[PDB]
Amino acid sequence: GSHMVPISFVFNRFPRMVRDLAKKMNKEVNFIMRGEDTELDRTFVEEIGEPLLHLLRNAIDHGIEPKEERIAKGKPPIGTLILSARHEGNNVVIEVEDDDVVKNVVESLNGSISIESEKDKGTKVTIRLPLTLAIIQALLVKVNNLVYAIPIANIDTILSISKEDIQRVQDRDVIVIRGEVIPVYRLWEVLQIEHKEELEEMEAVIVRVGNRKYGIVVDDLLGQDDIVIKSLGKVFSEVKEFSGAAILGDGSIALIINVSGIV
Amino acid sequence: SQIGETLENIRSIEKLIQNIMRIARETNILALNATIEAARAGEAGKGFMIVANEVQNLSNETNEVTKQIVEKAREILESSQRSLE
Amino acid sequence: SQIGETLENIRSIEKLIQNIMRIARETNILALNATIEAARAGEAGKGFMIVANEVQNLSNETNEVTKQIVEKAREILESSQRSLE
Amino acid sequence: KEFEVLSFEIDEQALAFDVDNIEMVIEKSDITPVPKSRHFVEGVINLRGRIIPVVNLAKILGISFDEQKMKSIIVARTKDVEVGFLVDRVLGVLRITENQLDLTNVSDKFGKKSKGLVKTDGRLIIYLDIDKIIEEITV
């Protein structure tokens, strides 16, 4: 829903703001923005534009030396910094360059302005703000009327096993499938919910993690769908057993099971 | 009285039930035209439009039953006045 | 006995709609409180206040009219009481 | 100097904060439970299209409580954080000033939470501080 718009609303505040920062330091420094229509996410109108002002204030003063120390170093009598902005996969890369409270100003809404450099070439700056807002194939599951989405790309297969196959071991339960052993887990348990008990043949979903994969047994299986994952505040930053909830269609809220976030 | 009282009543209920029948129409817009147009002022447009909605929903319910009065009340005479017959 | 049915046929309608004194009242209060907030809110989108008062009248409206139907339909009894005779 | 606060009680216990950090008020509804969350949180709700967490305010000040009387959800708004507070009945506006204030932050429990305590001709209207109160729920 138009959640995407040209960067003209959070990047054009430089062709005249970087000018004054060059006069208050007696150091001539060019400034040509290579592109200013980077359709980064709209919600960045206050966490990327401004933060890009602390990466340029060092592109003039703390970088290029006056003619007296310039034409006698290794840089031409005139330098040229370039303030760019593009998309590399799913991350807007509105970089900055030339020739710790701000370490959070951009890291608030994704980002982490750093400082890389060398000798007689200048310092380079680059932030990281995702510009991909929209599609996530997920597996919608239910547990006593609790819709929990499972990141599709993480799933490997959905097999229905009977409460027979299970063969407890050193502790965690397991099931022998294709010669391999999967540590089966009961979703409602790792989430601590008042479950009924255990139906006869329960449906389990095999999720892949790192180099292994465990099985996740659930109550009922709704149906895969493209949801709108959204960070559910910080009041949950502790609950590592998740990633972010989302509002389905009919209006029902559904949390996403961060696969790696479960014993 | 009675066979006449009924009339002295139905009419006494009509001119009144019609009054409610009136409001149902005034509210049907005095609020509907305030929501479908509330999306003009501050961002609270989406917040006010809904609160204004319900106003009608649980309001119409009046007529739903209120009109159910005449519907039967009119039978009173329809039968009592007919009892004259 | 339809006439003997008026002895209650409407009795229900009146009490079923009587729900207004409660549900219709409800909406009113709920909104009236939303006026307190909508007010202390700001001033730019005051457009939501210029109508947050609409219900204040819409409600006090069905009041004089509803008080009328209860006053009226209640006559049928006084009459049907003689009628049932 | 004229403060506008939201008046409401929590079992014979009055509280209130400046509307400056208020969005609206709703009634306790389908509060989707958040697993392994934090004892003082109810869960999250769908409002206007976003998922706002419903905290149990009364459960923070270690005061009275009643899942039943808790029928009013107060939605707040910090610098960029949005949180709803489940509480009891609500009153409304209330004109505050340096006259109604009677600072005595040396006669109770939880401190920083409340900026002070006001009095209306002899009431129990306690002035809360959403900012510092929310700052505890966060970080």
TrEMBL record, chains B, C:
Coiled coil: 55-85
Keyword Coiled coil: yes
Protein name (Swiss-Prot/TrEMBL): Methyl-accepting chemotaxis protein, putative
Keywords: Coiled coil, Transducer
GO biological process, one term: signal transduction
Superkingdom of this protein's organism: Bacteria
Keyword Coiled coil: yes
Gene Ontology CC terms, in alphabetical order: membrane
